[PDB]
Amino acid sequence: TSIDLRAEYEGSGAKEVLEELDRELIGLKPVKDRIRETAALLLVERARQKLGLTPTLHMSFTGNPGTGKTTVALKMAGLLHRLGYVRKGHLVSVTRDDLVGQYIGHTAPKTKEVLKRAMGGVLFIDEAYYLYRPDNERDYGQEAIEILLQVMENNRDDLVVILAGYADRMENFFQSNPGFRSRIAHHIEFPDYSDEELFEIAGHMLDDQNYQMTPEAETALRAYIGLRRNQPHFANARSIRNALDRARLRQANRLFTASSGPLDARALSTIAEEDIRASRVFKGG
């Protein structure tokens, strides 16, 4: 007659999954609160079905690389299975090259078989928009879309689909293939790490390698981070790693060229302001 939401929250073990996500995803509170929130709606809409009032679950995760897309998607498959929306809470992750066949006619079995594997859980199409390439001739992508779109409509109660990738490309993909928008019930946005967070990471990375930055070099990175995030294909922590790898190289070539004579652990463990500002990022790319 009336329902207890907290009981179902504690009953499903959905709380456990949300803890498992805060423990397994390095502080991206913004996204985590959005997953907390959707978990609430998923909970309520479950209780609504229970008191006698056919869902819709497909979703889209958009943002840059290294923003938690997959590791959230995994926890989502779990959560979904916990709240009885899915039979076996398991995540089949797949690119476009897992769905489109090279030879004519050999796409529809391949897409169908991936879907056979996916049944009872979640399919995760990474950079889905690459299914639609009328740019390429002899690309049979249009057909994998047809089948995808078909399952999301009809054969629903055994599958949840997650499209993922860059937001700009996802939006364009919807333009050309509409009828996806009315099949995605959750448009989740994954933003980057804040500057202070990106700096903390860069800090820890150098701690684990045994390197220190000079105070002046620290502010160089901060200048760097802020610039980089605004340039194309920003990969968050991979972009940091990549900047440090390059800084380490430049430092090694400072010390080898400077060749003043013998040098101690400080000089060798130190990344200087020179090593970061030499980056093309400060020039424009």
The answer to whether 95 is annotated as binding is: no
Q: How many residues does the chain have?
A: 285
- The single residue among 82, 96, 183, 228 that binds a second copy, judged by CB under 8 A, is 96
247 in contact with a second copy (CB under 8 A): no
Question: Binders of a second copy among 178-197, rule CB under 8 A?
Answer: 178, 181, 185, 187
The answer to whether 69 is annotated as binding is: yes
258 in contact with a second copy (CB under 8 A): no
Q: Which stretch binds a second copy (CB under 8 A): 22-30, 78-86, 238-246, 275-283?
A: 238-246
If the CB atoms of residues 93 and 214 are measured against a second copy, the closer one turns out to be 93
Q: How far apart are CA 110 and CA 100, in angstroms?
A: 7
Identify the CA nearest to 35 among candidates 69, 6, 1: 69
105 in contact with a second copy (CB under 8 A): no
The answer to whether 55 is annotated as binding is: no
Residue 250 beta carbon to a second copy: minimum distance, rounded to whole angstroms = 9
Inter-residue contact 271 to 211 (CB < 8 Å): yes
280 in contact with a second copy (CB under 8 A): no
The answer to whether 284 is annotated as binding is: no
Residue 42 backbone zone (phi > 0: left; psi -120 to 50: alpha; other: beta): alpha
Concatenated DSSP letters for 165-220? Answer: E-HHHHHHHHHHSTTSTTT--EEEEEPPPPHHHHHHHHHHHHHHHT-EE-HHHHHH
Q: What are the binding residues?
A: 63-70
